[PDB]
């Protein structure tokens, strides 16, 4: 019941504005029960947090016991939610009270064990990355709380846009699904019918200062890339002109849109309205660079997952390495060399000189990682794929070689 929830939250907000604590609390619960019908644990947990924001650790069931009973239940929700770091953070508050305010060590030991479980899970139980979907409601046909507005929706586990948009169209059967992701004109905005834009957007890692300069393990940093996020990207490729049948990359630019929601996700709802939108354009060069970095980040991340666990199937490793070592179908970075390393490209742009060196570094950077990963593959490859591994090495050797000369060993 998105409408009911939106309604409940609209009610709930008003009550906050006009100090009606009794009413506000009644609505928190109404809202919580709704999430539970849907199995939205994490959003249920965040909503209860609105109650405890009102409570305090005092003896005035008194406040401390109530806040305590509440924290327990919330922590329970986050556990189902698999927001272990959120759970841990509530455990610490409780533990402080147990340790320093009421000296309940028995309950404290229980709390610590609960934290040991969450810390362990963070590292050992992989959680599926959720997807974010932007929806725009652009008809004049829409009610005033949806009208010409963009919302970001947090995907359920393994929920894919095809599945989501289907339910959405079900909700509105006269709405037409737009065929552009491009910001609509005022011609559509002031129309009588309902038009719906829907696409997947990319979350942006919010900056946390805990991890600001320290070396944090992928395992615990990746989680923040897709959760606790307030900023999102959509990238679209636009060709500018002088297209080459050989390498599309030279002429490919990206238009990138940014959406900022008013609140982080996850929170009290599965969606928050976009409050700011920005667009920036990235040049084929800048694009090549992101592409190179992603590729190196992935290889490094993979070699690390494999250095750790040895019960990991190798297929996912073969695949990644080979597709980068011997990119038969798509270009390879030769396309990037052919596209930007001409004497001519440099002459036209002198600004990019700082960038070109950066692009060059990634290529030199690639080889070590590749070989590193190849070493692993060698050790643990089933014998029916030995021939396959042997070729992959030859290309790599070949590759190591041409690259080392052109670019110094790194």
């Amino acid at each position: 019941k998105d409408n009911r929830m939106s309604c409940t939250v609209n009610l709930l907000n008003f009550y906050k504005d006009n100090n009606r604590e009794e009413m506000y609390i009644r609505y928190l619960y109404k809202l919580r029960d709704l999430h539970l019908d849907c199995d939205n644990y994490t959003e249920a947990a965040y909503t209860l947090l609105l109650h405890t924001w009102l409570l305090k650790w005092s003896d005035e069931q008194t406040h401390r016991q109530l806040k305590e009973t509440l924290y327990e239940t919330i922590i329970g929700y986050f556990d189902k939610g698999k927001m272990w770091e959120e759970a841990i953070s509530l455990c610490k508050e409780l533990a402080e009270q147990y340790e320093m305010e009421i000296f309940d060590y028995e309950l404290l030991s229980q709390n610590l064990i609960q934290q040991a479980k969450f810390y362990e899970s963070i590292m050992k139980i992989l959680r599926p990355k959720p997807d974010y979907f932007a929806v725009g409601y652009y008809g004049q046909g829409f009610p005033s709380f949806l009208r010409n507005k963009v919302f970001i929706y947090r995907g359920k586990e393994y929920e894919r846009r095809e599945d989501f948009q289907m339910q959405l169209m079900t909700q509105f059967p006269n709405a037409e699904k737009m065929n552009t992701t491009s910001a609509p004109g005022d011609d559509v905005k002031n129309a009588p019918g309902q038009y719906i834009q829907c696409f997947t957007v990319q979350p942006v890692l919010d900056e946390h200062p805990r991890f600001k300069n320290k070396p944090v393990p992928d395992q615990i940093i990746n989680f923040y890339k897709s959760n606790y996020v307030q900023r999102f990207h959509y990238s679209r490729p636009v060709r500018r002109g002088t297209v080459d049948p050989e390498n599309e990359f030279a002429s490919m630019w990206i238009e990138r849109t940014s959406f900022v929601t008013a609140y982080k996700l996850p929170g009290i709802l599965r969606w928050f309205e976009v409050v700011h939108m920005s667009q920036t354009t990235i040049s084929p060069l800048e694009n090549a660079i992101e592409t190179m970095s992603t590729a190196n980040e992935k290889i490094l991340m993979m070699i690390n997952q494999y250095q750790s666990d040895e019960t990991l199937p190798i297929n996912p490793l073969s695949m990644l390495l080979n597709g980068i070592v011997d990119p038969a179908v798509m270009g390879g970075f030769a396309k990037y060399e052919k596209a930007f390393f001409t004497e001519e490209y440099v002459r036209d742009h002198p600004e990019d000189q700082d960038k070109l060196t950066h692009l060059k570094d990634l290529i030199a950077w690639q080889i070590p990682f590749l070989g590193a990963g190849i070493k692993i593959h060698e050790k643990r490859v089933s014998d029916n794929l030995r021939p396959f591994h042997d070729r992959m090495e030859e290309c790599f050797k070949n590759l190591k070689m041409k690259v080392e000369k052109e670019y110094g060993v790194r």
């Binding site: 139980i125 599926p128 992701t181 297929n315 794929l385």
Partner: protein, 181 residues
């Protein structure tokens, strides 16, 4: 608890003109139908759930070029399922399914399942496309023809999709996985 996600290796074959790469990128990145961004690298992977089972799907983009006839089957071993694709608007690529791809696959992996895929399902109704084909005295492949071809080669499923409209795409990959489970 529960071990590791089932890793499924799926190998995609077909002519260069089939545009099989566009299928893999669109599905893996869950891209908008109109716009997807190419990369300079060959393989695509997705973590997906089918029939309540979560798996790590690896999509191998093989090279159609003939130069690779020696090199391409090296990665054939260990495959869980094969995706064979042809353009619905290229009877040549269709004929190559029977002529070259099926034989090659079957030669190398006798018991690995096969899914037949018909690409460019959106062009099969494009007027300009129909006209050019006629001038060459050719017509697009029809549903009944693709199915017969599948039956012939012993493919588990025959499916038609369009990377551009995205319609019928998800199904190809769902079904690829049902074939392995």
């Amino acid at each position: 608890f529960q071990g590791t996600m089932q890793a499924i290796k799926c190998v995609v074959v077909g002519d260069g003109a089939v545009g099989k790469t566009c299928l893999l990128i669109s599905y893996t990145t869950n891209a908008f139908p109109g716009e997807y961004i190419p990369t300079v690298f060959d393989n695509y992977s997705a973590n997906v759930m089918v029939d309540g089972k979560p798996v790590n799907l690896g999509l191998w983009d093989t090279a159609g070029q003939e130069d690779y006839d020696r090199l391409r089957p090296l990665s054939y071993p260990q495959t869980d399922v094969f995706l064979i694709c042809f353009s619905l608007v290229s009877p040549a690529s269709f004929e190559n399914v029977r002529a070259k791809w099926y034989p090659e696959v079957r030669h190398h992996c006798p018991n690995t399942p096969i899914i037949l895929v018909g690409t460019k399902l959106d062009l099969r109704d494009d007027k300009d496309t129909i006209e050019k084909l006629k001038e060459k005295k050719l017509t697009p492949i029809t549903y009944p023809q693709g199915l017969a071809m599948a039956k012939e080669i012993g493919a588990v499923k025959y499916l038609e999709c369009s990377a551009l409209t995205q319609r019928g795409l998800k199904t190809v990959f769902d079904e690829a996985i049902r074939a392995v489970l």
